[PDB]
Structures are given as structure tokens and as C-alpha cells.
Coordinates of C-alpha atoms and ligand atoms in Angstrom, one line a residue:
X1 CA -11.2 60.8 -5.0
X2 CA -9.2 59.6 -2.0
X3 CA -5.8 57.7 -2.0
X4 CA -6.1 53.8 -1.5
X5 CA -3.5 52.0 0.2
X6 CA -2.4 48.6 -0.7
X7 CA 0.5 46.3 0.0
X8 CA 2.2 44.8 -2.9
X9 CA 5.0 43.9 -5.4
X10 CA 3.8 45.5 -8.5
X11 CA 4.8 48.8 -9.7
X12 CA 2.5 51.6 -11.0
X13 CA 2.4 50.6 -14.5
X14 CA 1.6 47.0 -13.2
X15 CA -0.6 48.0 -11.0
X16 CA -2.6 50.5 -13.6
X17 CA -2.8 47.7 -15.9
X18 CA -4.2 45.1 -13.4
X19 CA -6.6 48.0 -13.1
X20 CA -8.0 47.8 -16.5
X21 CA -8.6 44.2 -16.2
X22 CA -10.2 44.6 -12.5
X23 CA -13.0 47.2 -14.6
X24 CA -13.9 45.0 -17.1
X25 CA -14.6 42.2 -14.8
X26 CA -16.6 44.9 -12.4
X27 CA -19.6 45.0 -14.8
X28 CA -22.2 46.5 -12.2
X29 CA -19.3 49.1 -12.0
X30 CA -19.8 48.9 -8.4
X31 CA -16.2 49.0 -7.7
X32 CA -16.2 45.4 -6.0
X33 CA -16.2 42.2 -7.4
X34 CA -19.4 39.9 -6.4
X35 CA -19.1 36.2 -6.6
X36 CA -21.5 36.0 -9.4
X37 CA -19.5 39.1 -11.3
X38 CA -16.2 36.4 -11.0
X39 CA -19.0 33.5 -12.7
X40 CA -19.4 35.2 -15.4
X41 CA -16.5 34.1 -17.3
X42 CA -15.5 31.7 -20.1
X43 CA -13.5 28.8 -18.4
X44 CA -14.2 30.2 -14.8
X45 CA -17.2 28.2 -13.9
X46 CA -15.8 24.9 -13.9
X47 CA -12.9 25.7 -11.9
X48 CA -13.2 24.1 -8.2
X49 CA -11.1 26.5 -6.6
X50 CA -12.7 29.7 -7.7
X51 CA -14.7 29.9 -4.4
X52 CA -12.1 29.0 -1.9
X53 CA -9.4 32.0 -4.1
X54 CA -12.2 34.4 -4.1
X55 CA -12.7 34.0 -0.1
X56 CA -9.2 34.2 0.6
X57 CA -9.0 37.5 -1.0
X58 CA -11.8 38.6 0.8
X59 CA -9.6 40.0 3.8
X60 CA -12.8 42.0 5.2
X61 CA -15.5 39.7 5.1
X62 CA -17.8 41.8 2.9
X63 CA -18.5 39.1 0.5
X64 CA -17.3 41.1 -2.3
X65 CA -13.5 41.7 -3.4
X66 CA -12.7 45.7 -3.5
X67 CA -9.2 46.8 -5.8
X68 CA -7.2 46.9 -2.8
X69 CA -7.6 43.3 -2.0
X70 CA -7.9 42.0 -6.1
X71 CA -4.0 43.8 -6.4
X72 CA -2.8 42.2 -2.9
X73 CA -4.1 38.8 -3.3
X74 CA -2.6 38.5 -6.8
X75 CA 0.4 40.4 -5.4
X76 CA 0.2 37.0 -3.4
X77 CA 1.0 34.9 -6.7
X78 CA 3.8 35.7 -9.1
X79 CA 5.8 36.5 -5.9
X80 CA 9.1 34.9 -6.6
X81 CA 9.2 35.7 -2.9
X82 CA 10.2 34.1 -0.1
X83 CA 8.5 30.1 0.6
X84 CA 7.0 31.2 3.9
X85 CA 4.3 33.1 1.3
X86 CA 3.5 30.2 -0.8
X87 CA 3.0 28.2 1.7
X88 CA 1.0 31.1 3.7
X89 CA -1.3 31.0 0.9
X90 CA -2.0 26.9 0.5
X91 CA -2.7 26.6 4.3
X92 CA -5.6 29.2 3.5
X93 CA -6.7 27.0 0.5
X94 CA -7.9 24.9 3.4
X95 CA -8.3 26.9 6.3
X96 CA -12.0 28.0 5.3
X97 CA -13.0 29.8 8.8
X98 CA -9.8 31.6 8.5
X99 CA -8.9 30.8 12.3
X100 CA -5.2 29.6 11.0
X101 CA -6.2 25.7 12.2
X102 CA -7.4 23.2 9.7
X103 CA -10.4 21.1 10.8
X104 CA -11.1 18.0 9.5
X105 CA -14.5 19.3 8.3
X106 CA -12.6 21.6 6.5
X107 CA -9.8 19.6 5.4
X108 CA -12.5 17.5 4.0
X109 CA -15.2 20.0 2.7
X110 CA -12.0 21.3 0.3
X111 CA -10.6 18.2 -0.8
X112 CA -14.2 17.4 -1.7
X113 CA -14.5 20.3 -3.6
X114 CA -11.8 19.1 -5.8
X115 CA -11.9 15.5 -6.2
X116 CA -15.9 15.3 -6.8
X117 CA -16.9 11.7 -7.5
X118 CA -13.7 10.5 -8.1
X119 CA -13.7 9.4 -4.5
X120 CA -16.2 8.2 -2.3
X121 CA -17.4 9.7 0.5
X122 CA -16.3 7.2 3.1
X123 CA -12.8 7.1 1.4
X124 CA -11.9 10.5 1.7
X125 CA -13.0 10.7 5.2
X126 CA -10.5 7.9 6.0
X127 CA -7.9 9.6 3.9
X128 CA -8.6 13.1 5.6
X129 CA -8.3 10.7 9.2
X130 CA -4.9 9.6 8.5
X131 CA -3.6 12.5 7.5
X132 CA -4.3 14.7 10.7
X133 CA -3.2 11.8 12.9
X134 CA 0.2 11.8 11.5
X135 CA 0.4 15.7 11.0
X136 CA -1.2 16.5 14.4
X137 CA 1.7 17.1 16.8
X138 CA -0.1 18.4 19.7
X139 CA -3.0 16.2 20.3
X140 CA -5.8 19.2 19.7
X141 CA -7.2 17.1 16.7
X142 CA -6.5 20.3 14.2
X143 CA -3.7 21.6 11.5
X144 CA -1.8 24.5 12.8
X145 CA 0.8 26.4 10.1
X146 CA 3.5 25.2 12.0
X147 CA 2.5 21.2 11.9
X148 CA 1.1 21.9 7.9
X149 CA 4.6 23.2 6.9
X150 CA 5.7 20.0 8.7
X151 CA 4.2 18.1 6.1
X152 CA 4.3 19.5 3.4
X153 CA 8.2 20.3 3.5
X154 CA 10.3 16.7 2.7
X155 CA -19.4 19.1 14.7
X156 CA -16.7 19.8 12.7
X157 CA -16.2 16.3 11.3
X158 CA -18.2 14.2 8.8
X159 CA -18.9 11.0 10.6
X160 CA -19.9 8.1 10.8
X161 CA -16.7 6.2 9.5
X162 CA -14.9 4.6 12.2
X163 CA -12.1 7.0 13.5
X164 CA -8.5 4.9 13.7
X165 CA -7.6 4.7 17.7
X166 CA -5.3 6.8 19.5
X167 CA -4.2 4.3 22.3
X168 CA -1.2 2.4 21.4
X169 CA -1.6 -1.4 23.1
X170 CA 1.2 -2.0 26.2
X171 CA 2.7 -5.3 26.6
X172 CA 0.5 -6.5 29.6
X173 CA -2.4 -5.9 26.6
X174 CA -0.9 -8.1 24.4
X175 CA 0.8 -10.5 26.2
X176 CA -0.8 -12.8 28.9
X177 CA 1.8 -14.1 31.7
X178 CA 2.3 -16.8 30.2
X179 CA 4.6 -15.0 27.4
X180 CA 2.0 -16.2 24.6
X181 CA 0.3 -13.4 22.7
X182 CA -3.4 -12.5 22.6
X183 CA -4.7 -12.6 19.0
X184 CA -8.1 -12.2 20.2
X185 CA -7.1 -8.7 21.2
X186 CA -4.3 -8.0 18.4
X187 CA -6.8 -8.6 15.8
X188 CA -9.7 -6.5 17.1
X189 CA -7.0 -3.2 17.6
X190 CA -5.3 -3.7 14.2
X191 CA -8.7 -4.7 12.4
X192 CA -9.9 -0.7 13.7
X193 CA -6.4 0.6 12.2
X194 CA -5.0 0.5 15.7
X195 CA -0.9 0.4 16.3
X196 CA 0.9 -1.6 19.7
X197 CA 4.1 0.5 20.7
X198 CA 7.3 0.5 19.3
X199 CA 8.6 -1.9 22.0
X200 CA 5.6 -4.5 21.6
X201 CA 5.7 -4.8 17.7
X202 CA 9.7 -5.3 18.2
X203 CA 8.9 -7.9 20.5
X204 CA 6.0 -9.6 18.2
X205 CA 8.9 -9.3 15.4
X206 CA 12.4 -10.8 17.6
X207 CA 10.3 -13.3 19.9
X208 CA 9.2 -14.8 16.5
X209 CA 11.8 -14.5 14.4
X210 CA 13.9 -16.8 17.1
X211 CA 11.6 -19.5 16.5
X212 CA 12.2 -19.2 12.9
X213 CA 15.9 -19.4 13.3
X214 CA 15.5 -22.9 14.7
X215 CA 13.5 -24.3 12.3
X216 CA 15.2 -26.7 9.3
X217 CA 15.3 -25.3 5.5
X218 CA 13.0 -27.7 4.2
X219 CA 10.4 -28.0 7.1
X220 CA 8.7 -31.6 7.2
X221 CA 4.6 -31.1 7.8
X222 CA 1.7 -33.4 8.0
X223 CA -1.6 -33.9 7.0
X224 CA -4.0 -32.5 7.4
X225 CA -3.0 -28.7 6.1
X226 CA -4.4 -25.6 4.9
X227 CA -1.7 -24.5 2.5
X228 CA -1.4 -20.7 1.0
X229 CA -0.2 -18.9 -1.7
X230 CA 0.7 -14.9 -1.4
X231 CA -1.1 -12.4 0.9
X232 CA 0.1 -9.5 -0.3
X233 CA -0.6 -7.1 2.6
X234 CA -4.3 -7.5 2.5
X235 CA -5.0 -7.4 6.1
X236 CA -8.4 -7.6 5.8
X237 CA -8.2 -10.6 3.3
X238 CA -6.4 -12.7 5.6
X239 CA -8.8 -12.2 7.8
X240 CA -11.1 -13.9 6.1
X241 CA -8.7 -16.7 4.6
X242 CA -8.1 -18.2 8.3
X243 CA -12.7 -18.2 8.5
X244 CA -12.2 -20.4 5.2
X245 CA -9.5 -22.6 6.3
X246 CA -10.2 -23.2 9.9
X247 CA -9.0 -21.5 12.8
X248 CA -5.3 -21.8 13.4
X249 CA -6.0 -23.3 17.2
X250 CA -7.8 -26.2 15.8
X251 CA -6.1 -26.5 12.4
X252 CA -2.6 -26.9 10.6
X253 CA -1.2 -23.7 8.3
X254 CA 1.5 -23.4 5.9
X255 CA 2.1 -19.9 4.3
X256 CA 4.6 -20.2 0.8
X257 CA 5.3 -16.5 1.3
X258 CA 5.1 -12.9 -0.1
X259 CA 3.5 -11.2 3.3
X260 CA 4.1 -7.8 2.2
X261 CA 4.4 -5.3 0.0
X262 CA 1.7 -4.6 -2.6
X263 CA -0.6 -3.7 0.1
X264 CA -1.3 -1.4 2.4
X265 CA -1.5 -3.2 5.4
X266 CA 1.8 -5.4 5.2
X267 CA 3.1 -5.0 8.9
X268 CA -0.3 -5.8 10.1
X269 CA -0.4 -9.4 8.6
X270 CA 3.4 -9.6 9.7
X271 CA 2.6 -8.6 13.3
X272 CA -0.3 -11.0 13.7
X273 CA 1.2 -14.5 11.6
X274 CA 4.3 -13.8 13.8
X275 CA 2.0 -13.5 16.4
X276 CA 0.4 -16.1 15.7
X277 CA 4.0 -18.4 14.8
X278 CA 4.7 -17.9 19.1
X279 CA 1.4 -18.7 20.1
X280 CA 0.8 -22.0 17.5
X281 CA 4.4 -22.5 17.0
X282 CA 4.5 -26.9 15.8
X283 CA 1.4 -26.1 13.7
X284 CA 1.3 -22.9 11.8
X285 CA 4.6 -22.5 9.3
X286 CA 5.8 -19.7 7.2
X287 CA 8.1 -19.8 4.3
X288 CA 10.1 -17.3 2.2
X289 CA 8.8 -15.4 -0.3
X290 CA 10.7 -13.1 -3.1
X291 CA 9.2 -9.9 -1.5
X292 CA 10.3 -11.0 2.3
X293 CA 13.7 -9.0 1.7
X294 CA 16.0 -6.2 2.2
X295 CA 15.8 -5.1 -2.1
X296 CA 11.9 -5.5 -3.4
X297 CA 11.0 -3.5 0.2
X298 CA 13.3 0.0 -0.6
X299 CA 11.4 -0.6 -3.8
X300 CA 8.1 -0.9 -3.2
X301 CA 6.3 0.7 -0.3
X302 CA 6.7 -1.7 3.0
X303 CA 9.6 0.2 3.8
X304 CA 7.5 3.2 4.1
X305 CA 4.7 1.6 5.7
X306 CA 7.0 1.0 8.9
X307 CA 8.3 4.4 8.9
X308 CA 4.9 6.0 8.5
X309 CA 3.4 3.4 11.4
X310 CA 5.8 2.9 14.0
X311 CA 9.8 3.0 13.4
X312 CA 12.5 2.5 10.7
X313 CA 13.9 0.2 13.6
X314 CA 10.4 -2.1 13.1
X315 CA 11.3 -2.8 9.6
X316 CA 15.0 -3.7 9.8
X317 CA 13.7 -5.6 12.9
X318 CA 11.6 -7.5 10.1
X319 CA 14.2 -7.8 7.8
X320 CA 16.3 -10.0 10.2
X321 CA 13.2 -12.0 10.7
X322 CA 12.8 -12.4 7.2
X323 CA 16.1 -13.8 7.0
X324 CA 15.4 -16.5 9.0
X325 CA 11.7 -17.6 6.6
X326 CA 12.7 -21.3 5.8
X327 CA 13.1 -21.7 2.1
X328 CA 10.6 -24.5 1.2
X329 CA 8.6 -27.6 2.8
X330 CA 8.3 -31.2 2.4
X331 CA 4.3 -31.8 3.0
X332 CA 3.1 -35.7 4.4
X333 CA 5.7 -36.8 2.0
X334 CA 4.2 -36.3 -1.3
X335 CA 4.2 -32.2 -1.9
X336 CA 7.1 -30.5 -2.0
X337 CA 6.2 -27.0 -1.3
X338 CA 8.4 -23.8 -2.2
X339 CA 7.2 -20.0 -2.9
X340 CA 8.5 -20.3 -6.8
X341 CA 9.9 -23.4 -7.9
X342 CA 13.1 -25.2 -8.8
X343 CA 16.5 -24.6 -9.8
X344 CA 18.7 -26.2 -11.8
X345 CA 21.4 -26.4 -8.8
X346 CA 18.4 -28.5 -7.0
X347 CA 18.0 -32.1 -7.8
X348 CA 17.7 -33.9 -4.6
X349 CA 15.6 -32.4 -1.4
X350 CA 19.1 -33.1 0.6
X351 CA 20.3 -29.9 -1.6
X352 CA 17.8 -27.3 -0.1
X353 CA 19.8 -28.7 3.6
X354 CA 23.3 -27.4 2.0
X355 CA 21.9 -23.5 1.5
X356 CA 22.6 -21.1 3.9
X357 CA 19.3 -19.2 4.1
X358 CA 20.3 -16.5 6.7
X359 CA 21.2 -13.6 4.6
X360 CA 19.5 -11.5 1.7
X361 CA 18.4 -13.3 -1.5
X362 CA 21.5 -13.1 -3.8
X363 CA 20.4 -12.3 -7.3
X364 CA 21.0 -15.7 -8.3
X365 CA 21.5 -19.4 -7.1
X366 CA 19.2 -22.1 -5.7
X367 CA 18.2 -19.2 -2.9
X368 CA 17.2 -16.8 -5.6
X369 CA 15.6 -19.9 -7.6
X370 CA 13.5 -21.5 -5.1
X371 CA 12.0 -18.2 -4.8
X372 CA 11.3 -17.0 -8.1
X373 CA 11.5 -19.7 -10.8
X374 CA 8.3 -19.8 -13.0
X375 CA 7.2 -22.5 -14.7
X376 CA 7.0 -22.1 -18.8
X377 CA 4.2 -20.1 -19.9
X378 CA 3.4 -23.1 -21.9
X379 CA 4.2 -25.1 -20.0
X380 CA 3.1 -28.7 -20.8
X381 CA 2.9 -27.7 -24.1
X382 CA 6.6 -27.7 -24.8
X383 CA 8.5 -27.6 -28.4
X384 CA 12.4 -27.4 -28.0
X385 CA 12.4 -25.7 -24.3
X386 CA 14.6 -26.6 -22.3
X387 CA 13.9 -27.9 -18.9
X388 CA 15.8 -24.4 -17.5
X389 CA 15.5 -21.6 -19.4
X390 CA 16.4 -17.3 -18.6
X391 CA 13.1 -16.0 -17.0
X392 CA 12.0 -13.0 -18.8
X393 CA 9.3 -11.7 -16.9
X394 CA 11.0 -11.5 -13.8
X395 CA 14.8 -10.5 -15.2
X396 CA 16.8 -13.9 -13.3
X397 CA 16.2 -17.2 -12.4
X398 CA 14.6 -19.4 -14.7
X399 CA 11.4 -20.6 -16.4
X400 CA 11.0 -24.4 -15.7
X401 CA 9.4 -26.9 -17.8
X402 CA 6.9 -30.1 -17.0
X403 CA 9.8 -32.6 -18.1
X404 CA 11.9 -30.7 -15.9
X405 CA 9.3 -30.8 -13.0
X406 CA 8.5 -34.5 -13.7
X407 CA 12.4 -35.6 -13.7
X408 CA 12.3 -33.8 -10.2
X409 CA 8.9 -36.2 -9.2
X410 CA 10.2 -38.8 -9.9
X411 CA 14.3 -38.4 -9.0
X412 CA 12.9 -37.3 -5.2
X413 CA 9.7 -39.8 -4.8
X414 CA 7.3 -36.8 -5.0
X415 CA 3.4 -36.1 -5.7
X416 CA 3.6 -32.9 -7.1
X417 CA 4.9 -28.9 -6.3
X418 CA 2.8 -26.6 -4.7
X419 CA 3.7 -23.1 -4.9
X420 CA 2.5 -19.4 -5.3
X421 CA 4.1 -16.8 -7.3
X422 CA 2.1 -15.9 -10.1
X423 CA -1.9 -14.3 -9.8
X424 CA -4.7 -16.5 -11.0
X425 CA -8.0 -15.2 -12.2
X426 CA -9.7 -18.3 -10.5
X427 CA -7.0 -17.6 -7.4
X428 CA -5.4 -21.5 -7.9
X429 CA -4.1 -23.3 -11.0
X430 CA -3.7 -26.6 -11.9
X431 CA -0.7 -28.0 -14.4
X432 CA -0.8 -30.9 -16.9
X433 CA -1.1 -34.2 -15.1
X434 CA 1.9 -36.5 -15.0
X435 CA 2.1 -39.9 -17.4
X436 CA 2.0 -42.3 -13.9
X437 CA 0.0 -40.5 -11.1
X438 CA -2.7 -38.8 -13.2
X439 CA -2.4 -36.5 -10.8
X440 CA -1.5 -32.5 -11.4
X441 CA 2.3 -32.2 -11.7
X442 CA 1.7 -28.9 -10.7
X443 CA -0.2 -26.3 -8.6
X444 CA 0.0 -22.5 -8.0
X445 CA -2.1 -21.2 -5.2
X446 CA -2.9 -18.1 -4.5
X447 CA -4.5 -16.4 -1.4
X448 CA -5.0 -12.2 -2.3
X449 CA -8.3 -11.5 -3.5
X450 CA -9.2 -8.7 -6.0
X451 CA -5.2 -8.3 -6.3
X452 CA -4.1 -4.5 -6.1
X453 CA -8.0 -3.5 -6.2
X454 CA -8.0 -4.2 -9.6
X455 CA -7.9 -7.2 -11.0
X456 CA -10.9 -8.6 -9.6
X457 CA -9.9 -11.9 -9.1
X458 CA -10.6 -14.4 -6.9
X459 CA -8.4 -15.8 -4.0
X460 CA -8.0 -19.8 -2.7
X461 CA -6.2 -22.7 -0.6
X462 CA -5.4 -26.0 -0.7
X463 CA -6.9 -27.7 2.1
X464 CA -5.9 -31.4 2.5
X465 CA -7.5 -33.8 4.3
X466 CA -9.1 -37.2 4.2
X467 CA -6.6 -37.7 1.0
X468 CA -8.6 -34.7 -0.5
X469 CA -6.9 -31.8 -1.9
X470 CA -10.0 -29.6 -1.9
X471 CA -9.5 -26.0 -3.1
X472 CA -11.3 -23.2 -1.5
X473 CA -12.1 -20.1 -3.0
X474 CA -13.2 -16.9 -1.4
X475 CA -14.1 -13.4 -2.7
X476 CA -12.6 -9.8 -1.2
X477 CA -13.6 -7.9 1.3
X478 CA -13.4 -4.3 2.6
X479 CA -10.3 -2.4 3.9
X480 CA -9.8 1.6 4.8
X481 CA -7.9 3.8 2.3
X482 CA -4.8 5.1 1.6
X483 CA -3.8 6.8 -0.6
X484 CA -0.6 5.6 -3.2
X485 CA 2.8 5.3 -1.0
X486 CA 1.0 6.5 2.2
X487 CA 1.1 10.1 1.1
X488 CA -0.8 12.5 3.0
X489 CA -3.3 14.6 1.3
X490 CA -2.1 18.3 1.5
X491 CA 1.1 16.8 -1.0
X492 CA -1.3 14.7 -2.7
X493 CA -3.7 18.1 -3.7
X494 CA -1.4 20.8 -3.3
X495 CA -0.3 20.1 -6.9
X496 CA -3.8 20.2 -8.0
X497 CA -4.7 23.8 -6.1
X498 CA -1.3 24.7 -7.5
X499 CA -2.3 24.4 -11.8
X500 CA -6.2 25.3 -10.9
X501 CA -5.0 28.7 -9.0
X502 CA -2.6 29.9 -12.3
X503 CA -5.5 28.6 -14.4
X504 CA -7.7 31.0 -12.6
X505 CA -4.9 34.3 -12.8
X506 CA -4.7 33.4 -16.2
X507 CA -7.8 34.9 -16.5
X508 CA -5.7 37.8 -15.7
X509 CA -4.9 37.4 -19.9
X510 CA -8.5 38.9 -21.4
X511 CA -7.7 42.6 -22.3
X512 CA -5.6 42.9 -25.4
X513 CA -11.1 -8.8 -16.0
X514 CA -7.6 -9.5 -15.7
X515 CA -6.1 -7.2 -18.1
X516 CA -4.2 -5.4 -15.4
X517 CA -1.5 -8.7 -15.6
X518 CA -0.5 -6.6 -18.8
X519 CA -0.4 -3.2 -16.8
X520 CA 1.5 -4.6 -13.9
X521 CA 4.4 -6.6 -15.6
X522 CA 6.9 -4.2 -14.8
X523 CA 6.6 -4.9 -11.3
X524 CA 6.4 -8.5 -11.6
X525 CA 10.3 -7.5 -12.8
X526 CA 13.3 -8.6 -9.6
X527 CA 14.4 -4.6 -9.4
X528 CA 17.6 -2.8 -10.6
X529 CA 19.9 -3.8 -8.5
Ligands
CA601 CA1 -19.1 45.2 -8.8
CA602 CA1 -13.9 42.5 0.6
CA603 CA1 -10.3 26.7 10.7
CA604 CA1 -2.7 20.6 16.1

């Protein structure tokens, strides 16, 4: 029989009527709802967020929700109300001790309430990792409301998965005296997620990319050679590759491109093979790849990778580099090598001399071709194609065909091509034989294994030596997680707490194999330009 006060945006009616349904879910008439009273609903059982809602509401602590704080907290909702609310209420989604910081614990406990099995345990962790590193302004290793509405707007932890390092490696680190660059200590930091500063990357990237600006268009290299296909930002990969073909002190490399951007470690294997181009410069060679400019890295996600790690100034520092990627090599006189393939405009190697390579990829010519030409999807097989033809699958350049590859043979005194472009289940490819050599007139390597997690392929290189082109073939290995385009995972599962919380209210409503080469084709597309 005493007045109860309570801070809302309803008016009486509304607040009579949320009354009637507060009753009939009080069955022990107790006037305050228990946790198993909420439970004993049709679709409210299999709702995740039921417990965390509940909680919140909870403003005293009892365990139990009393009228009062049933009418505020969904006075909470429906609010129209200022942003400062809505976001009030999701940082208490994850703020469980109600302290107003987010612990990782917590940050991970909630998330893990949500995404069940969908994740493992280890992944999450790593996921919940990043996220605080990049949100945490103040160095405290917790979330406060100012650095969550940060991100959003645009003991205590569950160990043991490596934590990513806070110390950003100096340039005395990295570089000995000498100038030269210590991979021994570049790898181990980047292998535990580790960054180098903003001025030592920038160096990595310049000191590099000024060797590349002196080398010729068509490179001339020598047996013996561990050739490579695409990388695809799987850091960890690469790793391995250089364990398979030899170490890069003892042993010549040529890379036919594509460093970046279907993975998430891009800058990483750009930081370390320009690294590694200072330290080994007469002996380990990159060329250019389609991805290795300005337009396919606004589309897909390296352009984000080097804002989220480091600086926007670290990726157009790499985009000058890139410029500066030769276009193709001529291998111990036999191999021409090139990222795609041929172009029409290309008949002698004294044409790939003429080309001015130091600018972006125009959206055709022999630049464009050399880079994405495929050959004929039946190729070898061929029944009025001819030799060029309008690429499809990519959207410019063109598809060539074994006549067209064997004029080129023989016109230029050449073996065979070997390039990278397209994945291979078996991670190479071999091409019909030509008439004379009996030898493959073609050969597509490619160095990513288990391509975009997915397609579960297997990754190779050519190693030549001793007149044997021996291909070696290596399965995957493990890298962290991230989630898709580097979000963080408040943005990620704020849309999820967002649909399950109005699911809940709504309660409110009871009175009255490579297969994946199909999935991905779209983005084996040149983009919009
Ligand atoms: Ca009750
Ligand atoms: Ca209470
Ligand atoms: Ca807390
Ligand atoms: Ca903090």
C-alpha cells in the first residue's frame, strides 16, 4: 500500500499495462521475478542473453527483478532517446561485475555465451586479445565506456594462448650496424603477432623498395632456384615454404607475386621478403603480382590491415614499393617467368624492356597482361580459340592458348612459362607438353596452402637443380585469428545482442574439396573500376 518510485518514459496507461504482463510472468506471486520464473517461457530458454538482460536489470543485487526495475530496464529499450543510452546499455551487456570496465574474462565469458561452438576456445581468446589491444587507450589492460564508445562509433583472463606483445622493436633491434636487417629477430617478434614501429617498418619498406627500383624488367636468374607462386598473406605458410625450399642464405628465390591481400597477415610477409630482399639482395627476387597495387588493396582488406597495424603512411609507403616489383623473369635461359602470362602486345622478351613499370597497373596493355592473362580453360584442347581471347573470369586481359604459348617458345628460344595466378588443388599444374621438347609448355605454381581456410588445398614450388624441376608440396599450418576485415568484436556481436534483446521484449507480446573455386569467382574478378 505504499507509492513506488520509478524512473521512466512510459506513461500511466503504459505503465499499468506493462503491469499486467509483469503478474502473469510473477507466478509465485511474490512480487519479484526469479531467474527460473523468466525460464519458464516458450522461446525464452534458448535465448543466450536472457541471463546477462536479467542481471542488468537487477540494479540491487537481490537476484530477483522487483516492478520498479522490470518498468526501468524496459524503459531502457524502446527509448528513441538519446545514443549515450543505447550505448549505456551494450557496454553492460559485457560489463558482468558491473564495475563500468570490461575484462577480458568478461569480454570473453559473454561472447562465449553467444557464439557456443561456433568458435573454438583458443580462437575467441585471440579474437577477444586483439580487440582490447586496439581499444585499450590507457595501458590498464581493461574497456572503459569512454574507449568502448571509441570503438563502437565509425585471474581475469582465460589463458594459456600466447598474448600478442606490447613492445614495438626499435631500429638498433632490427638492424645490426652494418645496415642489414636481422631476420632471426624479425621473424620470432612477427611470428608472436609482434609490430616494429612506424619508423622501422617505413624503413624495411623504402630501403627495399630502392633496390627494387634498380633492378631490370625482366630480371635474368640462374640455376639453381626455388621458384614460387602466390602467398597470399599467409604469414605463417611462408614460414614454412622457405623450411621446404632451403633457407634463403644458402639458396636462390624467385617469388612471381601476389604478397597480399586475401590474408590476414599481408604486411607481415611484406615486411620480412623486403627484409629479406636488403639482406640477400643478388639472390632472392620478387616480381609483380595483380594484387601488388593501389586498386585490388582499397578493395580487399590490406589497406585495412596497415591502418589497423601501424599507419595509413605504411601502406602508401608499400604502394610505391610495389611500383617498383619487376614485371617478369628470364630463368637460366629456358623459363620465362611472369605472375600471369602473355599478351598479345608481347612477342619478343626485348618488349617487356620497352614498358614503363613504375606506376599503377592500367586496366589494360602488356602491364595489365603480364599480370593477369590466363591460359584457356581448355587449354590444350583447343577447337576454334584463338590464340588471344577476352578473359571472362577476371573481366580484362586475355585467355591465352597452347598455340599461342608455343608460337611464343619457339619465336623467343624458350623451355616453357612458369607462372602463378590461378589455385591448384594439388598446389602446381602441369600444361600439355610441346610437339619438340616433350616437355610441359606450361606450369602454374602455387605456394598458399588451405587457400582462404577453405579450400583445403595443397601448396608447392619448383625447385631446380641438377637439370631437375622437382615440385615440392607442403601442407598448412596454424595462424591466430581474426575475425573478417579486422573487425573488432563489440561491432562484430553488438548486432547479435541487438536482435536477441528485442527477441526477448517481445516476450513483452503474451497478454491479449575445392568447390569453394565456385564460391570465390567473384573475387577472382579485376574490380569496378
Ligand atoms: Ca515472484
Ligand atoms: Ca532486484
Ligand atoms: Ca568489469
Ligand atoms: Ca582501459
Amino acid at each position: 500500500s505504499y507509492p513506488l518510485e520509478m524512473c521512466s518514459h512510459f506513461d500511466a496507461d503504459e505503465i499499468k499495462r506493462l503491469g499486467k504482463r509483469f503478474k502473469k510472468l510473477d507466478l509465485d506471486n511474490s512480487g519479484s521475478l526469479s531467474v527460473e520464473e523468466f525460464m519458464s517461457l516458450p522461446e525464452l530458454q534458448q535465448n543466450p542473453l536472457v541471463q546477462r538482460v536479467i542481471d542488468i536489470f537487477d540494479t540491487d543485487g537481490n537476484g530477483e527483478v522487483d516492478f520498479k526495475e522490470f518498468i526501468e530496464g524496459v524503459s531502457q529499450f524502446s527509448v528513441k532517446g538519446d545514443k549515450e543510452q543505447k550505448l549505456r546499455f551494450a557496454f553492460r551487456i559485457y560489463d558482468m561485475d558491473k564495475d563500468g570496465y570490461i575484462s577480458n574474462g568478461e569480454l570473453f565469458q559473454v561472447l562465449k555465451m553467444m557464439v557456443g561452438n561456433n568458435l573454438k576456445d583458443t580462437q575467441l581468446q585471440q579474437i577477444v586479445d586483439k580487440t582490447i589491444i586496439n581499444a585499450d587507450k590507457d595501458g590498464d589492460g581493461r574497456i572503459s565506456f569512454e574507449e568502448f564508445c571509441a570503438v563502437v562509433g565509425g585471474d581475469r583472463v582465460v589463458k594459456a594462448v600466447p598474448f600478442p606483445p606490447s613492445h614495438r622493436l626499435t631500429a638498433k633491434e632490427v638492424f645490426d650496424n652494418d645496415g642489414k636487417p636481422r631476420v632471426d629477430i624479425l621473424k620470432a617478434h612477427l611470428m608472436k603477432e609482434g609490430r616494429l614501429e612506424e619508423s622501422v617498418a617505413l624503413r624495411i619498406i623504402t630501403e627495399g623498395a630502392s633496390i627494387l627500383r634498380q633492378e631490370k624488367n625482366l630480371l635474368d636468374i640462374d640455376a639453381p632456384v626455388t621458384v614460387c607462386g602466390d602467398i597470399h598473406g599467409q604469414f605463417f605458410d611462408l614460414m614454412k615454404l622457405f623450411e621446404v625450399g632451403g633457407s634463403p642464405a644458402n639458396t636462390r628465390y624467385l617469388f612471381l607475386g601476389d604478397y597480399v591481400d586475401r590474408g590476414y597477415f599481408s604486411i607481415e610477409c611484406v615486411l620480412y621478403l623486403w627484409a629479406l630482399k636488403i639482406l640477400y639482395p643478388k639472390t632472392l627476387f620478387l616480381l609483380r603480382g595483380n594484387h601488388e597495387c593501389r586498386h585490388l588493396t582499397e578493395y580487399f582488406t590490406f589497406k585495412q590491415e596497415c591502418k589497423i597495424k601501424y599507419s595509413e603512411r605504411v601502406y602508401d609507403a608499400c604502394m610505391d614499393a610495389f611500383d617498383c616489383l619487376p614485371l617478369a623473369a628470364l630463368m637460366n635461359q629456358q623459363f620465362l617467368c611472369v605472375h600471369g602470362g602473355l599478351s598479345p602486345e608481347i612477342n619478343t622478351l626485348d618488349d617487356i624492356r620497352k614498358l614503363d613499370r613504375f606506376k599503377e597497373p592500367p586496366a589494360y596493355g602488356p602491364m595489365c597482361d603480364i599480370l593477369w592473362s590466363d591460359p584457356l580453360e581448355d587449354f590444350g584442347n583447343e577447337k576454334t580459340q584463338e590464340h588471344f581471347t577476352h578473359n571472362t573470369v577476371r573481366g580484362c586481359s586475355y585467355f591465352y592458348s597452347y598455340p599461342a604459348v608455343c608460337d611464343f617458345l619457339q619465336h623467343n628460344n624458350l623451355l616453357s612459362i612458369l607462372r602463378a595466378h590461378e589455385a591448384q588443388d594439388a598446389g602446381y599444374r602441369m600444361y600439355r607438353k610441346s610437339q619438340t621438347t616433350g616437355f610441359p609448355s606450361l606450369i602454374t605454381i602455387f605456394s598458399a596452402p588451405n587457400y582462404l581456410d577453405v579450400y583445403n588445398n595443397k601448396a608447392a614450388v619448383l625447385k631446380y637443380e641438377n637439370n631437375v624441376m622437382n615440385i615440392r608440396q607442403f601442407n598448412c599450418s596454424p595462424h591466430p585469428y581474426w575475425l573478417p576485415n579486422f573487425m573488432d568484436v563489440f561491432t562484430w556481436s553488438l548486432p547479435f545482442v541487438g536482435e536477441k534483446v528485442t527477441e526477448m521484449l517481445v516476450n513483452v507480446l503474451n497478454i491479449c574439396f575445392e568447390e569453394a573455386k565456385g564460391l570465390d569467382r567473384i573475387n577472382e574478378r579485376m574490380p569496378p573500376r
